[PDB]
Design a protein around this ligand. Structure first.
Ligand SMILES: Nc1nc2c(ncn2[C@@H]2O[C@@H]3COP(=O)(O)O[C@H]4[C@@H](O)[C@H](n5cnc6c(N)ncnc65)O[C@@H]4COP(=O)(O)O[C@H]3[C@H]2O)c(=O)[nH]1
Ligand SMILES: Nc1nc2c(ncn2[C@@H]2O[C@@H]3COP(=O)(O)O[C@H]4[C@@H](O)[C@H](n5cnc6c(N)ncnc65)O[C@@H]4COP(=O)(O)O[C@H]3[C@H]2O)c(=O)[nH]1
Ligand SMILES: Nc1nc2c(ncn2[C@@H]2O[C@@H]3COP(=O)(O)O[C@H]4[C@@H](O)[C@H](n5cnc6c(N)ncnc65)O[C@@H]4COP(=O)(O)O[C@H]3[C@H]2O)c(=O)[nH]1
Ligand SMILES: Nc1nc2c(ncn2[C@@H]2O[C@@H]3COP(=O)(O)O[C@H]4[C@@H](O)[C@H](n5cnc6c(N)ncnc65)O[C@@H]4COP(=O)(O)O[C@H]3[C@H]2O)c(=O)[nH]1
Ligand SMILES: Nc1nc2c(ncn2[C@@H]2O[C@@H]3COP(=O)(O)O[C@H]4[C@@H](O)[C@H](n5cnc6c(N)ncnc65)O[C@@H]4COP(=O)(O)O[C@H]3[C@H]2O)c(=O)[nH]1
Ligand SMILES: Nc1nc2c(ncn2[C@@H]2O[C@@H]3COP(=O)(O)O[C@H]4[C@@H](O)[C@H](n5cnc6c(N)ncnc65)O[C@@H]4COP(=O)(O)O[C@H]3[C@H]2O)c(=O)[nH]1
Lengths: 293, 293, 293, 293, 293, 293
């Protein structure tokens, strides 16, 4: 019985700068405890849309300084269909290149919707004997697929199928982490610790937004309910202070400051600090270039 | 350790003649085994959309002949905002009258969205010591709230709040049943048996439909995954034969016939027949006129 | 032994209708458990600003239906110096009349500032042998003094001294409740249960607002810190859902609905329900018309 | 059980010279009893405003002769927004340089307000296992942030956030000392000894001053009330003689003389002399350049 | 061993309204405890100058409502030599008439200076076998002698001698009370309880004022020193709040309000309330019309 | 129980030749009984005005021949502001030099007034654990401060404060001796023996003189009253013969003859002779260079 820790990077658009600021501060705590990256402290990383461009980068081993550098120097240009995806593609090739999803150092689950069939899809690494087809994809294509919503980006054809943004259906990536730890990893729920670094989003479009918000809250409350018998085993690092804030470079200042303050609040809790004071986790890859089993 | 059985009536619009026909066919077994209604064989009833109306009618003790009579004699008229809700209101008062949600004979969970706050809400009978405010509502108002979607019906103001249809977020009422049996009834998942009598539904609206279908499938697959270690403990009575059917009174014929065939297929499985061959279930009401504890 | 329960009503201006709604739904539980009013379940009541006109009304025995009737029928007119205190005065005489502060059924602490000396003052019922001069005041004058701020109301001269609103300094009436239970009631902090039904408020004025908000948060966090070793012994019923609300009669609707939802959430927690299921509180008055000791 | 002694320096503006004269006299006793500085006799140092530039200097190990030299040779120049923070900045770099807040020899708590979020903040040395982010700051920036009020100094941007003066909210640094000894140090209140070397300050601005004075007195009286059961465990060295004084170099004379007289009065009390006749205090740093634990 | 209680009415000029208001509030406590006047709770009453016009009135049995009526309706006119004492004489005859000093109900000591010899004199009632010549004087003449200072009033010739104001030498009437209790009443100092209701006063004249203030403080500190071994046996009701007051009818308001607040503070202390909860004191007159021995 | 003997040198101006002559005559008995100086027979020495100078000289160990030499050879020159203090300063440096007040061989109390604050001050040797700041002063500065009255000498700035003559307030140094022996030495009054070698002094100035004389007599009579139960324990060596004398070198003759006659009268009383026939007193210094405890 050792703790199965999940990092559920929730977010959307340009508020992602909050998610990368909270992650630069948490990273420091990992280093100071002797880890190579913040991806060595977690057994699973789940993200949706932009949270997936950060989740893949975290698991690949990318320094969080560059994930933040993306949002405060390239954030305007990146974040036909109101965007052309070319700058995002350039930065992602800059980062990854031609690496496949099986080259990640941490198991990830990237939910997304198959527009062709119109059905949920999850792009996962080979962390179970049964996952054998998603480790061959370009990390660039996975990143372009997860962060591709209608009226935001053209749908990305990874292969024969067209995929849209994952936040449309699985707007909470903390239910995916808990579910994946319950059926792929056969983990008892008492051993699951979820850290969800999410953020709040900023007649028909009104209805779509209402449905999306309601569907994120429904799944978040389900995760909170399943983790109530075990105290402090699900903690969400949200900017609950911006809603209490009595008061785009200025917006960068507010986002950065909110991220730093939320990470400071989180590091003051011993159970959050206990995510990073452990021996480096050992992975079990069942396929791909890093096959251990 | 006795089996906690859940009835998850999934349904949308007129295809409800399928859900009411399968329920009318299962009533036959329920009575032949010596029960008063099909609501005496289940510990929880969850439904969204028209399923909610059928779920409330099932739990209230209404004969399933009249629930079917609603769909093949009043189905066209009932199923500004393309409908006026007056015929549905008349039939619901005809059925219920001025009964409160605490007069139900079976615990129910009716998910719905608070349009005012734009957040998930569940209307629940007083079945837990913690449910103390939803047993006072009109069953008519609950039925008008659950089956009230934009472009279908005006939003129903039960009280100070306006509510929209529950199928928008909790499109699968079998995840609600399983969760309730986990966070309210403190039931071990091996003791939970879910019977989901659902049916298949018939650029922006395309995206909304895709998102709704994807969100129903995601939650359905989560329920199927959590119930795989226990064989045959989650069975869905779906019209998987209409998709294999090589070929509005005619539509009534197809819906009825499909319901009868699906119920015939279900009754051929001993584990489905074991839902109805048990002593009548004893309820524990913690508030309202039927308070037992 | 006996749990010392405190009700810390925080309410500024028109969003007092939230405080009056949460208390109409908490009195229901109070009556359903067999109490005469919601003032029989608490051993101390503290309010500042409108929370004091509600705190005095609660302790006097006024039905909470009329406290709500004040905010949705007289709220605009009541809430020179932008407001003639005459309306409130009429409603307060219609409620109280010529009753003195010693006629209250529950000990209250009403903080306020002496503008003459410019120093903190607390108007308290004679609930300690050392309180002997504030039980002689008009409840009407106390209510007009607590809810009297510059640029809102003229300063009220209760006697030879002029008093201004208490929210200016003691913006959190939950630190006053905890302190009074600590220095007047000689209560061990483990026996103190605080229920704070507050609400969020809506270059020099900016600085004043910033200072007031900072001073409310500082004292609130001090109360939260002193009550962390004892779980769930300080619960604040705040409209944390309006800050999550994706969406003046309309404002009345939002305030009412938020109050009802927050009270519903609070009543779902057993420790909140345990405030009202206890034997009636026996008072010890050490002076005034009701001196029992 | 050994005494936990707190030094709560309160000093607004030029009447800080009082706080420096009282300290130089109290350091004499400190040295005569065999200590290196007056920071070796205390287990916590709290300060607000100028009292924070003195509190940091005391804890850093700066000789109190230079803290007094600041007020009688540089006091006019230091004490757009009526004051260019440049002078103070030069003197603070001349004192500290590039030392971080983790290089202090005594735990300090410097309250301040985050203008960006508009919320209370406390800059603390790493004296608890939960304080891990404020030991990295420049002492110069902390000093420029604590002593930065509107209409006095421009707001100081330590990092991504702008901070204003701490005296605006936490005008009494003796409630902060008592609270920190209660929630961070887990100290029994009978073991806490507070020595507060404060001083008295000299239509809208009138209201702001009234609110600030009322908020200082409220918190001071709360500290006095919590420390009444333990005699002489909270002593405030205030210039209560200048208000009894029957009668800017002349002002320097009055301030100096008042400080010397108040320190003489304080040293005549054996319980004050017992703060300095003890073995040197041993610190427990849980992070930073001096981490011992 | 029963407590010997002394009332030392210190005061001066028109601030006497403070002393008369603190005494109306303390009187109420005497009545509420069942005494005829505030002169039945004390064994000795010492006053200087105006405090003597109040001390004589208190001991004579005059209602304190009229002593206050003197200061807020006749205060300007009463308070050649800037002030011909005709109005004061009229009001004193109105009060007393032709009563001798031996008709007082409480022993009093009125210090004064014999201008003829230029030596201290005390006008005392026959409360010792050795006091046999002062009980024959007019109370009007004693009142006109005690409140008669140069540059204020002409010197009053009671008999063959001219007398000036007593505040010139015995500016503190609490040292006189303690001394009398020590040599006339042969009381142990542990049994002496002094309640001093005084107030603060508002090149050669500067020197005279400095000397007078220094001589009042010297004697006050001597009384405080002799009463330190016995806690709370010397309490001075001073307006220490007007020196902390951040802010001639207005002056009447401040004086009255300060008196009411100081009396409220005093009545909150159980040892002050214990002055009035005792059986009525029994006097021993050794000469005059009320001779008991 | 051994006798606590006090020497209260009262004096003013050149009449100080009486005190110096009486002291020179008592030195004869002191030496004839085997003591080093007249300061070895007393436990405390209190003086005001020129008495302070003589008191400091007596305690320092100065031969009384030189104290008399000051008054009959330098008396005219020493005794802007009618004097320049330079001759007195020269003679005092001649005597003391750079010795601090802690180098005295006998505890002394020198009353004086702080002109800055306008409050009583006493300069005391470190004779109690609580006296820790007056032993560092120059004896020359103490002597120049005690003997510095307006219209006589410029005010002497010992440090940051200006001091005036002590005879203005504490015109009788025998009440100071008795009080000190009561509040600092914790001596029973039956063990206190006071020997007061004083002398009689020679429209606004008339009032000042009257007040000063009245204040000296008031305190003298208080000392006489407190020492009546113990016979001959307070004896004042006054020139009561010059007032009976039926009849500036001639004035020197009268002063010295009166001193010799008064000392002759005093030495004829056995209780005065018993001050000097005792073993040398042992001092307890609690601070300064002579610290014994
Ligand atoms: N995702 C994935 N699936 C693979 C791989 N190799 C084989 N498969 C198989 O494809 C099946 C369905 O693919 P899908 O992932 O797109 O739909 C998935 C996905 O839409 C959804 N789902 C998967 N993991 C989830 C999760 N952790 N949380 C919430 N929902 C989830 O449930 C569907 C069924 O998952 P399954 O694990 O039982 O079967 C896989 C799995 O058996 C592979 O490399 N990746
Ligand atoms: N101040 C500080 N907090 C840190 C550090 N590392 C983590 N934290 C955590 O940041 C949280 C937020 O602190 P804040 O400084 O922004 O506001 C603080 C401050 O506004 C207030 N507060 C703290 N100590 C106080 C005190 N002694 N007196 C009065 N008020 C105080 O309580 C807020 C929350 O305190 P907390 O201790 O429970 O959690 C800290 C603490 O757990 C750190 O290096 N410094
Ligand atoms: N539904 C309900 N809730 C009540 C009642 N009296 C008090 N409550 C309390 O109000 C809280 C929030 O009500 P909500 O129903 O509008 O949001 C609910 C609902 O949106 C969602 N939820 C509840 N049961 C669910 C379920 N079985 N499946 C999926 N989602 C669910 O979780 C939210 C919080 O659930 P909770 O039970 O822990 O707290 C309730 C509950 O404790 C009551 O009579 N009915
Ligand atoms: N005189 C003195 N006081 C000191 C020293 N170190 C500390 N103190 C303390 O300073 C307090 C006030 O000093 P002050 O001398 O200016 O006022 C003194 C002085 O004005 C007056 N006083 C002291 N001794 C006296 C006496 N014997 N007779 C008459 N009056 C006296 O009482 C005031 C307070 O006395 P305190 O002894 O209780 O407190 C001292 C004393 O405790 C010190 O070296 N000398
Ligand atoms: N005051 C008074 N004195 C009387 C009376 N009948 C006789 N006497 C005698 O006159 C003597 C001196 O008169 P005095 O009161 O004007 O001076 C008094 C007075 O100036 C002063 N004094 C008295 N009581 C005091 C006190 N309580 N506090 C401070 N100083 C006081 O001490 C002087 C001596 O008092 P004493 O009591 O030993 O002797 C009385 C006393 O024996 C009489 O009716 N009143
Ligand atoms: N409030 C009050 N005080 C009374 C009464 N009769 C006597 N008193 C006494 O008046 C003193 C001054 O009270 P204040 O109301 O003017 O300011 C009060 C008030 O400003 C503040 N305070 C009191 N209770 C508080 C509290 N519970 N929380 C926060 N602050 C508080 O402390 C000040 C002094 O309190 P205290 O209890 O030690 O002494 C009282 C109390 O002993 C009375 O009828 N009411």
């Amino acid at each position: 019985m050792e703790k199965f820790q999940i990092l559920a990077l929730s977010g959307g658009g340009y508020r992602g700068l909050f998610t990368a600021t909270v992650l630069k501060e948490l990273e420091q705590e990992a280093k100071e405890n002797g880890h190579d990256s913040i991806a060595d402290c977690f057994d699973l990383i789940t993200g949706t849309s932009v949270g997936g461009i950060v989740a893949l980068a975290i698991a690949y081993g990318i320094k969080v300084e560059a994930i933040v550098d993306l949002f405060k120097s390239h954030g305007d240009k990146i974040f036909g269909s109101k965007y052309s995806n070319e700058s995002l593609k350039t930065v992602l090739e800059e980062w990854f290149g031609d690496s496949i999803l099986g080259d990640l150092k941490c198991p990830v689950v990237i939910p997304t919707i198959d527009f062709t069939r119109g059905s949920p899809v999850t792009l996962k690494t080979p962390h179970n004997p049964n996952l054998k087809r998603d480790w061959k994809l370009k990390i660039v294509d996975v990143a372009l697929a997860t962060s591709a919503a209608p009226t935001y980006f053209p749908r990305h054809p990874i292969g024969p199928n067209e995929y849209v943004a994952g936040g449309l259906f699985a707007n909470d990536p903390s239910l995916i982490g808990l579910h994946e730890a319950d059926y792929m990893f056969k983990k008892n729920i008492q051993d699951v610790h979820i850290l969800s670094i999410g953020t709040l989003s900023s007649a028909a479009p009104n209805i779509i937004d209402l449905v999306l918000s309601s569907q994120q809250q429904f799944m978040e409350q389900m995760v909170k309910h399943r983790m109530e018998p075990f105290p402090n085993q699900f903690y969400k690092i949200d900017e609950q202070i911006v809603q209490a804030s009595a008061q785009s470079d200025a917006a960068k200042q507010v986002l950065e400051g909110n991220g730093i303050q939320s990470a400071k609040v989180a590091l003051g809790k011993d159970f959050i600090r206990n995510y990073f004071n452990q021996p480096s986790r050992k992975r079990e890859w069942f396929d791909g270039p890093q096959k251990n089993v």
